């Protein structure tokens, strides 16, 4: 999907939010409507969009709306990390939004945002944490693509009736852009372990125009003009933190390595207390260093000294 098609959908989706019927007797039969749900349940993958769009132009799905919302919520949260599948999901959600506006999109958005609430427990398995982070990144990607086409815009679109996650509740006065709110939450779960730094790098790589002031290509797609500024502030703070932690870890791993090496010269032993602690810290250091380098390259900044010769 090119920027032209994004803008086409944005215009249609904005009109739908504005109360227009922009989507052009309907079939209200049980067979037709359950047949639609079954099609949704096969998942949002490439090509599946066109068939579903035909149903939206032929079927009267109003009495199955609640079920469609739940079904789509599950499908959306489980979209694969495949660029073509994401595009299909965007076209399908846009169609549904154009047919039903807020009575579909409001509860969908509220339920979808639950995907960004941080766990309220500690990490038990870093293997599981990597899987969790992968899921969050996929959910963030899909959210952002739907933001850019004007489907998912702001908490202000959600009805009071429709629940929103705890981390987004009780907002008064000036609200931050929704993407800022989401990223401030997800970047800050167990930050010191370094797994969330990969959310930051994945996000800037895929959505670069949000981070480059000279890049105006998505300005017409952005809901609140403060977004680019807010995101730049958030990420520059995150970079300061990432650089600082990388430097702290760099000093620790080098110190432990040096003591281990001196020990091995003295005694000939392969193992000692220094390399045992080193082994626990090194993967964390590597996560921070890799991310420090990527963030530095993207924002054209020099990295702190992070030399380390390992293995």
Q: Report the C-alpha gap between 224 and 221 in whole angstroms.
A: 9
> In this chain, which stretch among 176-184, 197-205, 232-240, 291-299 interacts with Cl ion, using CB under 5 A?
176-184
Q: Which of 7/135 has CB closer to Cl ion?
A: 7
Q: How many residues bind Cl ion (CB under 5 A)?
A: 4
Cα distances (angstroms) measured from residue 217 to each of 13, 113, 146, 205: 18, 26, 16, 15
Q: Which of 100/180 has CB closer to Cl ion?
A: 180
Among residues 64, 112, 195, 223, the one that binds Cl ion under rule CB under 5 A: 223
> In this chain, which stretch among 164-172, 222-230, 272-280, 297-305 interacts with Cl ion, using CB under 5 A?
222-230
> In this chain, which stretch among 30-38, 133-141, 169-177, 237-245 interacts with Cl ion, using CB under 5 A?
169-177
Any contact of residue 224 with Cl ion (CB under 5 A)? yes
In the complex, the smallest distance separating the C-beta of residue 5 from Cl ion, rounded to whole angstroms, is 20
In the complex, the smallest distance separating the C-beta of residue 179 from Cl ion, rounded to whole angstroms, is 6
Q: In this chain, which residue has its C-beta nearest to Cl ion?
A: 177
In the complex, the smallest distance separating the C-beta of residue 265 from Cl ion, rounded to whole angstroms, is 58
Any contact of residue 230 with Cl ion (CB under 5 A)? no
User: Which residues of this chain interact with Cl ion, rule CB under 5 A?
Assistant: 177, 223-224, 227
């Amino acid at each position: 999907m090119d920027d032209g098609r994004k803008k086409e959908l944005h215009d249609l989706n904005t009109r739908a939010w504005n109360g227009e019927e922009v989507f052009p007797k309907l079939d209200s039969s049980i067979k037709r409507n359950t047949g639609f749900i079954k099609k949704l349940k096969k998942g949002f993958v490439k090509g599946s969009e066109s068939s579903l769009l035909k149903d939206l132009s032929e079927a009267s799905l109003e009495k199955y709306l609640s079920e469609i919302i739940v079904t789509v919520t599950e499908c959306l949260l489980n979209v694969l990390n495949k660029n073509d599948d994401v595009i299909a999901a965007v076209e399908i959600i846009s169609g549904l939004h154009q047919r039903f506006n807020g009575r579909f999109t409001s509860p969908l958005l509220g339920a979808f945002l639950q995907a960004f609430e941080n766990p309220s427990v500690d990490i038990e398995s870093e293997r599981d944490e990597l899987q969790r982070i992968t899921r969050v990144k996929g959910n963030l990607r899909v959210f952002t693509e739907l933001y850019l086409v004007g489907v998912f815009r702001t908490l202000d679109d959600i009805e009071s009736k429709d629940a929103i996650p705890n981390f987004l509740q009780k907002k008064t006065g000036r609200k931050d852009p929704l993407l800022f709110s989401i990223l401030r939450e997800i970047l800050n779960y167990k930050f010191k372990l370094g797994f969330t730094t990969t959310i930051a790098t994945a996000f800037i790589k895929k959505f670069a125009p949000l981070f480059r002031d000279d890049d105006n290509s998505w300005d017409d797609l952005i809901y609140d003009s403060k977004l680019k500024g807010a995101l730049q502030s958030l990420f520059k703070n995150f970079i300061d933190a990432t650089f600082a932690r990388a430097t702290e870890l760099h000093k620790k791993v080098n110190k432990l390595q040096r003591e281990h090496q001196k020990c091995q010269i003295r005694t000939g032993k392969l193992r000692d207390e220094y390399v045992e602690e080193y082994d626990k810290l090194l993967p964390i250091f590597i996560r921070f260093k890799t991310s420090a380098i990527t963030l530095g390259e993207f924002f054209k900044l020099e990295i702190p000294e992070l030399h380390h010769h390992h293995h």
